[PDB]
Design an enzyme around this catalytic site. Structure first.
Site, PDB file in Angstrom:
ATOM      1  N   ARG A  53      -0.071   4.397   2.943  1.00 41.05           N
ATOM      2  CA  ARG A  53       0.020   4.150   4.388  1.00 41.05           C
ATOM      3  C   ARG A  53       0.363   5.351   5.292  1.00 41.05           C
ATOM      4  O   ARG A  53       0.288   5.235   6.516  1.00 41.05           O
ATOM      5  CB  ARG A  53       0.993   2.999   4.668  1.00 41.05           C
ATOM      6  CG  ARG A  53       0.425   1.615   4.399  1.00 41.05           C
ATOM      7  CD  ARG A  53       1.482   0.569   4.607  1.00 41.05           C
ATOM      8  NE  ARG A  53       2.437   0.485   3.488  1.00 41.05           N
ATOM      9  CZ  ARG A  53       3.620  -0.097   3.605  1.00 41.05           C
ATOM     10  NH1 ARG A  53       3.959  -0.587   4.792  1.00 41.05           N
ATOM     11  NH2 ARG A  53       4.466  -0.165   2.566  1.00 41.05           N
ATOM     12  N   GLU A  81      -4.696   3.928 -10.875  1.00 41.85           N
ATOM     13  CA  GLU A  81      -5.521   2.735 -10.676  1.00 41.85           C
ATOM     14  C   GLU A  81      -6.622   2.681 -11.722  1.00 41.85           C
ATOM     15  O   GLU A  81      -6.888   1.636 -12.316  1.00 41.85           O
ATOM     16  CB  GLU A  81      -6.159   2.745  -9.284  1.00 41.85           C
ATOM     17  CG  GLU A  81      -5.177   2.704  -8.128  1.00 41.85           C
ATOM     18  CD  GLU A  81      -5.883   2.605  -6.774  1.00 41.85           C
ATOM     19  OE1 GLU A  81      -6.436   1.519  -6.492  1.00 41.85           O
ATOM     20  OE2 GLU A  81      -5.895   3.601  -5.999  1.00 41.85           O
ATOM     21  N   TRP A  90      -9.273   6.190  -0.807  1.00 38.64           N
ATOM     22  CA  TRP A  90      -9.550   6.934  -2.030  1.00 38.64           C
ATOM     23  C   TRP A  90      -8.532   6.557  -3.115  1.00 38.64           C
ATOM     24  O   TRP A  90      -7.543   5.863  -2.843  1.00 38.64           O
ATOM     25  CB  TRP A  90      -9.569   8.443  -1.770  1.00 38.64           C
ATOM     26  CG  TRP A  90      -8.303   8.975  -1.190  1.00 38.64           C
ATOM     27  CD1 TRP A  90      -7.148   9.270  -1.864  1.00 38.64           C
ATOM     28  CD2 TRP A  90      -8.059   9.295   0.182  1.00 38.64           C
ATOM     29  NE1 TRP A  90      -6.199   9.755  -0.992  1.00 38.64           N
ATOM     30  CE2 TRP A  90      -6.733   9.777   0.272  1.00 38.64           C
ATOM     31  CE3 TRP A  90      -8.836   9.230   1.344  1.00 38.64           C
ATOM     32  CZ2 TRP A  90      -6.168  10.186   1.481  1.00 38.64           C
ATOM     33  CZ3 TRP A  90      -8.274   9.634   2.543  1.00 38.64           C
ATOM     34  CH2 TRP A  90      -6.956  10.105   2.605  1.00 38.64           C
ATOM     35  N   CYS A 113       0.824  -1.194   0.000  1.00 41.26           N
ATOM     36  CA  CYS A 113       0.000   0.000   0.000  1.00 41.26           C
ATOM     37  C   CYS A 113       0.864   1.251   0.000  1.00 41.26           C
ATOM     38  O   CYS A 113       1.676   1.465   0.923  1.00 41.26           O
ATOM     39  CB  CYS A 113      -0.952   0.022   1.195  1.00 41.26           C
ATOM     40  SG  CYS A 113      -1.946   1.531   1.232  1.00 41.26           S
TER      41      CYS A 113
END
Ligand code: HEM
Ligand code: HEM
Ligand SMILES: N#Cc1ccc(CCNCc2ccc3ccc(N)nc3c2)cc1
Ligand SMILES: N#Cc1ccc(CCNCc2ccc3ccc(N)nc3c2)cc1
Ligand SMILES: C[C@H](O)[C@H](O)[C@H]1CNc2nc(N)[nH]c(=O)c2N1
Ligand SMILES: C[C@H](O)[C@H](O)[C@H]1CNc2nc(N)[nH]c(=O)c2N1
Ligand SMILES: [Zn+2]
Lengths: 413, 408
Positions: free
Chosen positions: B110, B284, B279, B107
């Site tokens: 973070r 992506e 979000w 991730c």
């Protein structure tokens, strides 16, 4: 470890099965509890260390020529073994040397160009004794490989290491690179990556032009002696000025690059023998120049200047002005090389060829070590096929290895 | 040993000690690295895992070895004895969930880890209850476009036969349809799940961006379909700030990425249903969702509208249309005041977060293969950052798709 490892391509759903990993010889630096796949880098050998390493390689060689266990094989083993016993080393035959060089490339997990591995011209420079001779061998290499723009991959192999105090070394990191000069005001002229090596050359007596694209002199060490400077004949250095098919102003940036990427500071290891000087060359993938050499911040760093000329909104990052400039720069690079009929491959073609190469290697060899972190191109990663491809990384020998920079270890005479 | 990691741009060197605390395997060995492979209970096993988690919990609140620490341990042991399991305190549940996010090596987001709104839904018993908790999650997290990170945590696994599962891979996704001509309408990644919903009685609009219904399984029972109230589903119409024709492509996306198929593991307990949301990073949607071959695959259509040279790949027509698409996505969300982050800002924040974690925690597990964005890699700082990857618990784990395990 289990006998079979499977890798999936998440785009095509192709599954491949790897058995070749069982022949892995060295450590990755990873463990059961930690992965180091994004780490850059995670006094000679003795008789008893050398016997199994030589035998390992000789067996592999006679296996490749479908002569394994033959009389010639057994006799070769006997000869090598006696030689190690009576000289603490041995000499590869020309065939073994060529085989070994080609397989070190074939085994380079970080190289995306390996579909070409079997087409490598091998120049045997084991008869070299001086730096002038090293220079002669290197000039011929550059001329042959360059071939007026129709580049052909090659390697020149200098005498192997003996006691470690007689190493042959090319002190240049590539045969052809541009000088970097640190200015009193903190700014850098030329290629900031080469500032150190440039300073060393200037110390040995090089008179630098102090320009942005000055080809560095060769600094060559033979037989453990102090290194010597030689200037490469400029007619042997093929260069491409960078222009753009749509932007007339791009030529005004004054960019150019050399055609021949020729790495010269790696160590070639074959059957436990160590060739500390083995300059090799192929040809460029566009992104190496257009993304890394040009757009890295610690390099030529031209994004801003190009962006300004593109008249992009440079105050928000979310405008992606950097990404826009980056594409055009990489277009200009490819355009410039193709227009000057100099071999170059774009990152889409290269990655596609590599996927084909890797599949063929799984089928005919039982696998193909590959370093995704290196194989995936520095721009547009996911729109190239390798992004979606699972890879297994491991170290097979013969291999190309890193070695300490010679200035850090050399005992000055 | 202490391990160093280097940034090759800045030459900053950090020292990792945290990795010494892990006990779960990575999948690599001394001989083979698997960093690019996507995926490499009993009372007896249960207590030490529980014990470890309590220890770190009480060590995190600077009360290691306290009366409460001692008592809690006693409390948990006695409970595993007498019930084959145990129940997390509220405090532990919240700490556990934030730390699974914190330990998530893949991730890039973070830096936000400690700002996580935790919804305890461990009292849920039915799929209707699930639907209600999920509607509340979506509404809280969407927040009219100013998105807020959240997780809803359904009852932990007992025997494997009474699992709570959200069958959707995300709470909000678009349908994919197999056409008679063998082509795919909508999102191809969701064709299987879409057919499962249709089999279950869902009436498909059979359009390109149809919001899928929720498929909710409570206590091991058959899943039930539910329609998310439309007013709760924030969507963004994608347009380009310079190319006025881009809106003609008819592209849209949803504002809320809310992953619902992972498993949250805390102290040996397994939460098979723990949908979480934050979000979007723009890539992506603009790189993976829109431009992947197995996805919406719009690169060709866009490059045609850009009138690019598409006969040779060395024109980088793919690369050009890619940047433009991603500019459109960022511009569209921002113009609609919907929270989004570009991959330069996000990677910068991550480098900063890494530095924080090294300073206060002695490390930060990080998966380079996942952290580096799928476009413009080396012009973001993370490309040049060395990372160490290792598995810390609590964690988010993958689990099998529920339709492979479920007897109806
Ligand atoms: C023929 C065309 C070739 C292409 C297109 C190609 C492409 C590449 C690229 C793009 C890299 C990544 C390096 C970087 O990003 O700085 C690489 C790595 C590498 N290549 Fe190839 N290459 C070619 C030829 C060769 C040859 C002829 C050899 C040796 C005989 C070779 C051996 C290696 C090795 C050892 C690495 C790893 C370098 C390192 O770890 O620093 N390559 N290749
Ligand atoms: C707040 C804004 C956030 C941003 C910008 C963000 C960004 C990302 C991105 C880009 C990925 C790569 C996923 C992919 O490409 O498919 C990822 C992975 C992941 N994120 Fe975050 N994230 C955020 C919030 C969260 C939250 C709230 C959680 C959990 C509480 C979380 C847990 C995870 C996990 C477990 C993965 C790995 C999933 C996998 O292995 O497939 N993230 N994140
Ligand atoms: N700091 C640093 C640092 C950065 C890069 C490298 C490795 C660079 N090797 C480049 C390399 C090696 C072989 C190649 C073969 C062909 C080709 N086109 N490029 C090639 C490029 C080492 C240290
Ligand atoms: N096939 C396949 C396949 C493709 C992707 C994944 C991983 C998907 N994880 C997506 C994911 C997870 C968590 C996220 C959190 C925040 C955010 N913005 N995106 C997030 C995105 C697994 C299998
Ligand atoms: C930190 C990271 O390992 C480092 O920047 C690597 C990443 N991948 C790379 N890939 C290639 N081809 N060349 C490189 O120099 C690098 N650098
Ligand atoms: C094979 C490879 O691991 C796979 O394609 C990974 C690569 N890196 C990724 N990185 C992110 N952020 N998301 C992904 O889905 C993937 N896919
Ligand atoms: Zn590894």
């Amino acid at each position: 470890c289990p006998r079979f490892l499977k890798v999936k391509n998440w785009e095509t759903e192709v599954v491949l099965t790897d058995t070749l990993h069982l022949k892995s010889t060295l450590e990755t630096g990873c463990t059961e509890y930690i992965c180091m796949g994004s780490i850059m880098h995670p006094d000679v050998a003795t008789k008893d260390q050398l016997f199994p390493l030589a035998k390992e390689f000789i067996d592999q060689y006679y296996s490749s020529i479908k002569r394994f266990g033959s009389k010639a094989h057994m006799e070769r083993l006997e000869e090598v073994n006696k030689e190690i016993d009576t000289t603490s080393t041995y000499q590869l035959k020309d065939t073994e040397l060529i085989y070994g060089a080609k397989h070190a490339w074939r085994n380079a997990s970080r190289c995306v160009g390996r579909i070409q591995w079997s087409k490598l011209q091998v120049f045997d420079a084991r008869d070299c004794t001086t730096a002038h001779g090293m220079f002669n061998y290197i000039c011929n290499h550059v001329k042959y490989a360059t071939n007026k723009g129709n580049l052909r991959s090659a390697i020149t192999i200098f005498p192997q290491r003996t006691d470690g105090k007689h190493d042959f070394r090319v002190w240049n990191s590539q045969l052809i690179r541009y000088a970097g000069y640190k200015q009193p005001d903190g700014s850098t002229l030329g290629d900031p990556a080469n500032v150190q090596f440039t300073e060393i050359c200037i110390q040995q007596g090089w008179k630098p032009p102090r320009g942005r694209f000055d080809v560095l002199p060769l600094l060559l060490q033979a037989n453990g002696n102090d290194p010597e400077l030689f200037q490469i004949p400029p007619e042997l250095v093929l260069e491409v000025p960078i222009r753009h098919p749509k932007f007339e102003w791009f030529k005004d940036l004054g960019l150019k690059w050399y055609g021949l990427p020729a790495v010269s500071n790696m160590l070639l290891e074959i059957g436990g023998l160590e060739f500390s000087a083995c300059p090799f060359s192929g040809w460029y993938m566009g992104t190496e120049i257009g993304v890394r050499d040009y757009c890295d911040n610690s390099r030529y760093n031209i994004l801003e200047e190009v962006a300004k000329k593109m008249n992009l909104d440079m105050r928000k990052t979310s405008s992606l002005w950097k990404d826009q400039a980056l594409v055009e720069i990489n277009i200009a690079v490819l355009y410039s090389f193709q227009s000057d009929k100099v071999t170059i491959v774009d990152h889409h073609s290269a990655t596609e060829s590599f996927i084909k190469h890797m599949e063929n290697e799984y089928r005919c060899r039982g696998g193909c070590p590959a370093d995704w972190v290196w194989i995936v191109p520095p721009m547009s990663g996911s729109i190239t096929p390798v992004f979606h491809q699972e890879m297994l990384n491991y170290r097979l020998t013969p291999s190309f290895e890193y070695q300490p920079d010679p200035w850090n270890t050399h005992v000055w005479k």
